[PDB]
Design a protein around this ligand. Structure first.
Ligand SMILES: CCCCCCCCCCCCOS(=O)(=O)O
Ligand SMILES: [Cu+2]
Lengths: 285, 286
């Protein structure tokens, strides 16, 4: 289990110099946009159709999907910078801050800062400011600059806490019928954050605002990946605790949710991403 | 070369009954839906973003993309019933018939016939009419069935001309700058149908109407694949004829349009499929 993924606060100022530079070199060989488009496709892709579940969100594929989404987003970093790995954003600890908007992560040498009120919350600081970065709307057409607004939502004024997370790791079941937004005592649902929406994951891309709330476009913003890194590492954590707890459903899950059913838009299956070690990456710790 | 892709009108019936029996199975195992989604997803992926050119249509990638598409589909169709291949629809020969709707490809035991004007052109006849076939739309949610309306468009009253096909096979260049709708003297653009459009491939689509008229809902209609079967066969012929010539652009291409770029939604490159034999199928003319 090599390729160590590192808390964003643990990184150097060269590490950070690198990552944010590799991303830009993706973004512009044409590659990035096709993770903006994969995440979007697989969310008009209801499983089945007309259900509320999509091959990713709101079902029991949500985590391994975003696992081999992160996975195959890394390499194309590693192919651009062997010694760049994907860092995670431990938002629970940032939650404790007096004002997390002052996390080293919103520093202006990484992703940048909060949106500017005056410019309609268009991010004007840091490497992804409007003018140095390029976003895409739902239609697959150009958008114009990033937008953020931390905590300007009534329904998510604060980031989730360490407690929130400790509680979620408690949950004995991976997922529970029917496998969607209403699944009770379901680690997945809760980690997604649909139990008392909008908790945990959901909460952030409700806390961060702009394209990180409307989902479909969510990958526009680089920190999407920092985010789901943390989500992934929380799931690597749960994984061990209940080393025993495995994926459910095993079958009888809508096609695309079971444990041996490929995950639009790839042919990849959870069976295939149930280990972060076999994937050749292990989280600082 | 083994797999052998046979003109629909050469298909013994048990062979038609075997092909239609599998398409369902693929549809039932919710395996077929991923094919509609793929094709609707590449069309929403512009390259570069904000420019007519999508991952499948409107660029040099149209042929190799739809060649890969099909391959994967034959493959799924194979894994299940090893004896089933993906047949082609030779529309240039149907174009002769007094009424090319009488083709025996719209036969009740095969694809079904034309839209019923009473039920708003739903298809009610054949293994596929509202009732045994389910139809997703652009967003991704069930719409209700299948629709056809043969040549109701004043734009495309009649399928391509078997004498057109020849003309497009004369073209020397696979494609040419700027690698889009306006490309001139490009095999790829003519076959696609933009030269005085709609022609050939584009004229096929508008000819059938219903879902097949619209770029994103096209693959709802199994005929999409025969159609594209034929379209791949034509390229294939083109490749043998103008063997010297090769895919273009090689580089300097719009990421996702060059010889060795991966083609959204896959990792596969035009290079990976420029030789169809090596993909393990051939067209019953060999
Ligand atoms: C100035 C006249 C405008 C020409 C046509 C405008 C829409 C008509 C196209 C009908 C077929 C569909 O064609 S499409 O444009 O939608 O692909
Ligand atoms: Cu998401």
């Amino acid at each position: 289990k090599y390729r160590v993924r590192k808390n964003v606060l643990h990184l150097t100022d060269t590490e950070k110099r690198d990552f944010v530079r590799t991303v830009l070199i993706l973004k512009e060989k044409g590659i990035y946009d096709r993770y903006i488009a994969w995440h979007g496709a697989a969310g008009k892709f209801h499983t089945p159709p007309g259900s509320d579940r999509n091959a990713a969100h709101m079902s029991s594929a949500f985590l391994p999907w975003h696992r081999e989404y992160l996975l195959r987003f890394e390499r194309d970093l590693q192919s651009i910078n062997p010694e760049v790995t994907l860092p995670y954003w431990e938002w629970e600890t940032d939650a404790q801050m007096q004002d997390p908007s002052q996390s080293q992560i919103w520093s202006a040498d990484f992703m940048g800062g909060n949106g500017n009120p005056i410019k309609d919350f268009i991010v004007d600081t840091g490497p992804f400011a409007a003018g140095r970065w390029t976003t895409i709307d739902e239609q697959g057409n150009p958008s114009g600059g990033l937008k953020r607004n931390f905590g300007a939502t009534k329904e998510a004024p604060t980031l989730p806490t360490r407690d929130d997370v400790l509680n979620a790791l408690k949950i004995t079941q991976y997922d529970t019928p029917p496998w969607d937004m209403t699944s009770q005592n379901s680690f997945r649902n809760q980690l997604e954050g649909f139990i008392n929406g909008p908790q945990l994951h959901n909460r952030v891309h409700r806390w961060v605002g702009g394209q990180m709330g409307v989902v479909p476009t969510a990958p526009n913003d680089p920190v999407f990946f920092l985010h789901h890194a943390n989500v992934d590492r929380i799931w690597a954590v749960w994984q061990i605790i209940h080393r025993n707890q495995n994926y459910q459903p095993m079958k009888n899950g809508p096609f695309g949710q079971n444990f041996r059913d490929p995950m639009y838009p790839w042919n990849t299956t959870p069976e295939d991403v149930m280990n972060h070690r076999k994937l050749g990456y292990v989280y600082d710790i």
